[PDB]
Amino acid sequence: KLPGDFGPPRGEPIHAVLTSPPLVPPPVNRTYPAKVIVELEVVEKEMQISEGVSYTFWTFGGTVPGSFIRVRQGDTVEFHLKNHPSSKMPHNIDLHGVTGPGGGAASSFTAPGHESQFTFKALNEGIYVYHCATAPVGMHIANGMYGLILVEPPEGLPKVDHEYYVMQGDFYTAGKYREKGLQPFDMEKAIDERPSYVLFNGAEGALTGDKALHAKVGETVRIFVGNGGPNLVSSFHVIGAIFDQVRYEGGTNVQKNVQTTLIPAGGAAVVKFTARVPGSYVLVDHSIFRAFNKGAMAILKIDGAENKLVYSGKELDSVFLGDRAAPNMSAVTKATQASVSGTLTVQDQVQAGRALFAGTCSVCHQGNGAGLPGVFPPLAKSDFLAADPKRAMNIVLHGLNGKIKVNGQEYDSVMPPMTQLNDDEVANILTYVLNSWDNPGGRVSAEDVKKVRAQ
Amino acid sequence: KLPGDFGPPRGEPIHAVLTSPPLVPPPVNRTYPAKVIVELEVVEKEMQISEGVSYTFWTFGGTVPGSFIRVRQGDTVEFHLKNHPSSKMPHNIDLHGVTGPGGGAASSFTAPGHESQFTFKALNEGIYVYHCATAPVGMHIANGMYGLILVEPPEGLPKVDHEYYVMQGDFYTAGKYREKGLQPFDMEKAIDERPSYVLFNGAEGALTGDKALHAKVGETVRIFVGNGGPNLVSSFHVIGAIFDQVRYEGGTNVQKNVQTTLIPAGGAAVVKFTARVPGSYVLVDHSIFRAFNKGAMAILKIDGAENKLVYSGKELDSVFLGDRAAPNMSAVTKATQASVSGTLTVQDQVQAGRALFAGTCSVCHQGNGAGLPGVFPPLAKSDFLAADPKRAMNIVLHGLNGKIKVNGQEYDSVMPPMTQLNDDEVANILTYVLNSWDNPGGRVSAEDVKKVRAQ
Amino acid sequence: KLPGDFGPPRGEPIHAVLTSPPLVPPPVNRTYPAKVIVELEVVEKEMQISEGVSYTFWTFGGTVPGSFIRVRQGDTVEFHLKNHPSSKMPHNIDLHGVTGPGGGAASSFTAPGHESQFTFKALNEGIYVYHCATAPVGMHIANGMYGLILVEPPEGLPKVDHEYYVMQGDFYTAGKYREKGLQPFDMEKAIDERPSYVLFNGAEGALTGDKALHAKVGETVRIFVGNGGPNLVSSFHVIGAIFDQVRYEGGTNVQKNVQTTLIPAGGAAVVKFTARVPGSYVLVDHSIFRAFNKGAMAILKIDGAENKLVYSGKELDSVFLGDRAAPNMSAVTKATQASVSGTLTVQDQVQAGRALFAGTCSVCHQGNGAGLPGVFPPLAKSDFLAADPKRAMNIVLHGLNGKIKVNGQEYDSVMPPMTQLNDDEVANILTYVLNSWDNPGGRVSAEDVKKVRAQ
């Protein structure tokens, strides 16, 4: 027969359970081919792509990436696609792994309010991307319309202690990175493959802080990793560890002991990890400006005993992770909501700047503003800042070099410009500094920073 | 000895036959090393890169990609390169697979009207890119100067039912995608790696519609896939199938059962496919905006019996392929030629818009303009369009949201802007709508759309 | 135990020797695990990124890439990081291959004047990138803060005749490629992944001409290849040869007989080469505009007997390598220093243009300016140039087409524009032509070309 043909379906039809990221449906745990029924519903909706930044996502099952599907090589899959009547657009699905033109696209076209169905046999074992396939295909995929389908080998995968679901995507907003408000899709930036954000699981901090993945020393972790694109190839990397194994789609070839691996646009791989020592392990795109300037990091946090003979050093902090070392940045969300209301208090700006000050500023000036005598001027009880706080907006946007004196000490150094910070971010950071460590006090508005930018 | 040394050439010299894409010279089918003579002639010439879009290609043997060369590991290759006296530039060749500095570049320098020769032994088995190697190398390669050379293993490749030749390239026009006329090379866009088109076999639709590759259910297909670049890496993908095998250059490593595979700039791979069920199978760069916005699709069309137990669904259509589902878009070519002549009739604009309307517009408004009551307003006998057809130019360029009434029915939806359409494309699409389904009639000029763009 | 655990350290502590690129520390040549002490010192300093182009590099041990580290799987590594008191910034290190959060980042934070230490066991065999891990991480990496660490298998690597150290990086200057002076870092270009230079070993010509790598026919060469990024993936290619072997990090999978191989951002591979025939072998990023327009070439020069039966052709020259065929371009460095001094002589401009004229101009007009009668007009004793030398600035910046007459011969051809040349480059090239082959003489200033650009 064809390969993957294990005969016709036995027993009762199975209604497939799909999971929201970062979780995975359990092993099918069976020795016979089945008829599997899949209900998947498209929903269009605003969600936070970043703190105080809203985006209209188009989703399979309400999430980016969309719901995870798990079947067995040889299963017969009756695939129903519903387009929720709130949707303004039509949608369909192309599943990689499907043998058939469009991988289902033609038979799955679905207007708002309608349901579609088509049937396919899962001939090919492996991990596979699925995505919308509706003109214009790039826009559907950029708005979040992708996920994974696992087709298990008949004997199933080897048992591990944890299975997780992580999917990278490149996103195209009209506004610049961390510009606040509802951000429309930007076709220009997408055609040019110049994304404003590059994200795991549909948002900045989706898998950092309180939202990290978890395992214990001695446990094995399997991650199903997708690249939804639409455009970027991922230099997919784990910081501080190594993958025991990396297997692309249903490839016969299996790479072992690598830390860095290229994932094509539309590609998917299964990686295996064994926790050897505790701490935060970062998943990134090692096209480093994606990781550190566009949101492309996810954390795996390991619990257990130190092993001083393998690694003597300290847990990850804000020197490396910057503002994502913290549990969350809800203070930024809260301050942004207040601006929209017109009820922005000084305390709102202070708790938001406190969040944003980590790494961004603390790497030189320290957590406590103390600085380092002769090398990094203090921000704590600072005569320099007191003397002219309006110049602090210029110092942040445009930088500072030359000899200067601060609390009667000489500095001849360089503070790089930080023009990438948005007006609200400069304002809140500075309002926190002024209201910390016995400084003058007061406040800096977004409006004040806008004026100084424009000169 | 060296590896690949099977002794000196036996028998008479063989004059090598080269094929034009997408065809491949036949298997050398011999057990002895030979002296192979290769005559390859460079030609500069305008060809259509897209409908009504002309480009000055620099070519090896009159095609992009250039003529395919097939020899045997151990052969001695006497390589003659002629530069046609019409050429304005000098040219040479670097063949990957050649052991020797420049892979032939120095000894093959050839001014217009001249012939060059150099001899090399084919030590390395595999599939290899060749390209021009003349300062400035990027310009020669961007203008189309690349192809493939197969060096067979001594026992030859395994027999398959079909062998085809597909080569991706990134192209850099002064004008934007589908801007009509003769388009010069743009050095700025090339240096920035921002291509206007991304193409298989030197043009949009080179391998779609009437120009698809063909096989029958049960047949094996081998594709020799090149990436000429100059700059892009291809996330090379088959929609709706799987590659039995992928082998890069003359690599010992062979990947099996993958759908998605990274091809480096200057890389080449051999993929094997087995037809299981009939329909169109799309080859793409799954950096999706290349595939769907810049021309990076090719079709393999399979004939034979449905297998309802493997795949129940319908053949690919314009929901997914958009305007390339059709056999061709000659109507666009014909209307563009008419504009240049100043003899553009209403019928010319109508048949051109009819072509362009598929997917672009039909995905929401339907093939027949009917729309879907309450969800997608009709274009068919439309009071809304009748009431002010000049506003239709604004609706296409800039989009439409809000409550509206069309043939006495309420719509509160969103039609995305389509500013990417060129003036001629908006004009012809709208002229087709006006002259279809009992609408007012009339015509929209490119000149009319230009004015509305500029406001 | 863990894998790589060969017990506790025996014998005396070893003080590790680190080498500057392109050299490599010798094999550890031992059968027991050791305690290895590593002293590495960060230095900030201006160096030439290109002729007459200065950049403030941040370096590990004074070089880009930074000093090479060589230890044995199972060694215990006491890692000391010093930040020289001249530094204006703090720094730390993340080593790929380290089992531990941040791969050392947290425990290695080091202000100007300070020393840090942390200890790790080398559990994982392979070749690994190390880099700075200090907010903002992208800037530290773009300024040159990366190198390699080899962790040998216990039995060591196989013996080869030569081992070399080559590392690619993408660089982001405010000024355009080969714009002269001290060039600041450009955050905009880095975030957009639009590098101005793409370099092996921290500069244009770092490994070309007099600075090429060397081997003899019959010798094996191992290259440790790094991609520091920060952003680019390398289509890493050897022109005119083949890699016997390519192995990524400590991967079990080993590819054999390939010419072209993708290296991820942050990736590293070990390639093996065997010299079969003499000549220059070029290492490139086959994203060709990096190689030929941004500095991404390195040369391996092989000495020994011709083998006419394998390759009949000539050594690489300026048709392919352009201005890098020569031993150096010191004349460009010397002329640029003179402009800064205000002591720029006619002879300074002539020797600088002579350097720059190779490939750029000589590919059509020839080394001697003779041209080719009827095809390429001469520059040698040229009536056309004599008649109006001020028009030569326009011809270079903007090109020339149409019928023309030169030394009483007709030409109807096309000379492409060369607007990419900087004002100083046009001026020096033209001053060389005027003062060569019995031409009028005189000089063209950078200031003259600036005026003609602006019209």
Ligand code: HEC
């Ligand atoms: C190092 C990498 C720094 C980062 C990150 C930030 N700052 Fe800084 N800052 C730095 C230096 C070396 C200097 C002195 C420059 C000189 O000419 O010698 C400064 C200076 C300031 C000042 C003025 C002096 C003072 O008030 O003590 C201010 C107000 C200041 N810096 C604020 C500041 C903020 C708010 C930061 C993050 C947004 C920030 N700095 C980052 C070094 C570095």
Ligand code: HEC
């Ligand atoms: C959905 C994804 C659409 C595509 C693709 C195109 N159109 Fe559309 N159009 C769409 C909607 C939802 C609406 C109503 C918007 C609202 O505010 O509710 C429209 C509206 C129009 C109109 C005006 C109404 C009418 O005449 O019936 C016109 C003239 C129109 N659209 C034309 C049009 C053309 C020519 C298209 C391709 C070039 C096109 N539309 C694409 C939804 C979608």
Ligand code: HEC
């Ligand atoms: C071919 C690929 C060329 C390169 C590279 C360069 N030039 Fe050229 N040049 C070329 C042609 C075909 C022509 C004639 C154009 C026509 O209309 O037929 C020219 C012309 C000139 C001229 C004017 C004629 C003359 O003086 O002989 C000059 C002064 C000239 N070219 C200079 C020049 C320089 C300085 C170059 C490098 C910087 C250069 N050319 C490159 C073809 C080509």
Ligand SMILES: O=N[O-]
């Ligand atoms: O390994 N860190 O980028």
Ligand SMILES: O=N[O-]
């Ligand atoms: O599988 N389609 O993009």
Ligand SMILES: O=N[O-]
């Ligand atoms: O093989 N040369 O680009």
Ligand SMILES: [Cu+2]
């Ligand atoms: Cu969709």
Ligand SMILES: [Cu+2]
């Ligand atoms: Cu896909």
Ligand SMILES: [Cu+2]
């Ligand atoms: Cu050429």
Ligand SMILES: [Cu+2]
């Ligand atoms: Cu090449």
Ligand SMILES: [Cu+2]
């Ligand atoms: Cu640093």
Ligand SMILES: [Cu+2]
């Ligand atoms: Cu790293």
